[PDB]
């Protein structure tokens, strides 16, 4: 049983016992969260419209990380314009606990 | 109070405006002198007051 849910303006197909990085949620490590389920994919393949009515997944947050340093570096030519900029997008590493109907 | 605790007031001392140190400082390649011209040349203009 999988299901598409939403978080950070995104849609993730998920299944229980899955480690899934997401946007930096607001929840203490070890905390759990129920999620908006876009659609239950499986036997009773119910289509969330726009969301499944009573269904929602449960996932205990594994912890907030910081993505690898994307080195955003703009450059214009013939103008003396250089912009080096470190960057690390935070994330909330999760575990799919289950999928509530 | 020992010597390491001696600090001027915040802003009492101040950096200089070092020029010609690249684009990052924003004061680079021209030292604020702009492009070509009598004023941009070394030595500069005549007496601007008069």
């Amino acid at each position: 049983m999988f299901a598409i849910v939403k978080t950070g303006g995104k849609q993730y197909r998920v299944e229980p016992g899955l480690k899934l990085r997401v946007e930096k949620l607001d929840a203490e490590p070890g905390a759990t969260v129920e999620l908006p389920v876009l659609l239950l994919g499986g036997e009773k393949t119910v289509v969330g419209t726009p969301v499944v009515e009573g269904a929602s997944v449960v996932a205990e947050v594994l912890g907030h990380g910081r993505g690898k340093k994307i080195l955003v570096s703009k450059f214009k030519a013939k103008v003396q314009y250089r912009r080096k900029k470190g960057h690390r997008q935070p994330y909330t590493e999760l575990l799919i606990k289950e999928i509530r109907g | 109070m020992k010597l390491s605790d001696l600090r001027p007031n915040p802003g009492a001392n101040k950096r200089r405006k070092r020029v010609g140190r690249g684009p990052g400082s924003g004061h680079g390649k021209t030292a604020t002198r702009g492009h070509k011209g009598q004023k941009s040349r070394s030595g500069g203009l005549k007496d601007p007051r008069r």
Binding site: - | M1, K2, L3, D5, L6, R7, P8, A12
Partner: protein
């Protein structure tokens, strides 16, 4: 205001005593910058393109040589040429305002004093011109050596008998200055140097 300890064979007297009750750390900062500044040799010299030992003859003609244009080898763009804007014989001294020097001096004394690290002395009966004299005195006088102390007095038998001490800084009363007062954890003065101190902040 600042009750000062006074060691002596008669025990520990004190003084009241008048000092600037408030410390303005920026002021002592400026004064120390003054003393350090004015004692700079300023012997940093260089050679401009006119000072350098080369000639003024153009190395090769302006045009048609293929080489880039150059004048004399002594110019600042040649290895060996003079320096542009290199340091010159320069005096870093300057007159810091007298009320500021005097005031700040009093404020340093107020710092070490009000922080307990001041100790006037009536006499130096122990010391007589030998170092160990001053050692057994100072340990006798409540000093171990961990406190780099600024010793100020007019007794050359005392100062001379205590110069070699690493943790002691020698001064006659005239040489009292904010820099040395900040250099030391604890301060020590003779009562005469106390007086010349007062007259110096009169």
């Amino acid at each position: 205001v600042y009750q000062i300890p006074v060691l002596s064979p008669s025990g520990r007297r004190e003084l009241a005593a008048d000092l600037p009750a408030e410390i303005n750390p920026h002021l002592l900062w400026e004064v120390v910058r003054w003393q350090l500044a004015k004692r700079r040799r300023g012997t940093a010299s260089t050679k401009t393109r006119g000072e350098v030992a080369y000639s003024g003859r153009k190395i090769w003609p302006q045009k048609h040589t293929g080489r880039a244009r150059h004048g004399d080898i002594g110019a600042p763009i040649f290895v060996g040429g003079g320096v542009v804007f290199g340091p010159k014989p320069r005096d870093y001294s300057y007159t810091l305002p007298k009320k500021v020097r005097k005031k700040g001096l009093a404020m340093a004394v107020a710092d070490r004093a009000r922080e307990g690290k001041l100790l006037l002395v009536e006499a130096f009966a122990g010391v007589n011109g030998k170092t160990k004299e001053f050692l057994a005195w100072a340990k006798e006088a409540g000093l171990d050596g961990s406190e780099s102390v600024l010793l100020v007095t007019g007794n050359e038998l005392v100062r001379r008998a205590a110069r070699n001490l690493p943790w002691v800084v020698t001064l006659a009363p005239e040489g009292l200055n904010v820099y040395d007062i900040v250099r030391t954890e604890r301060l020590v003065m003779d009562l005469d140097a106390w007086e010349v101190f007062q007259n110096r902040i009169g």
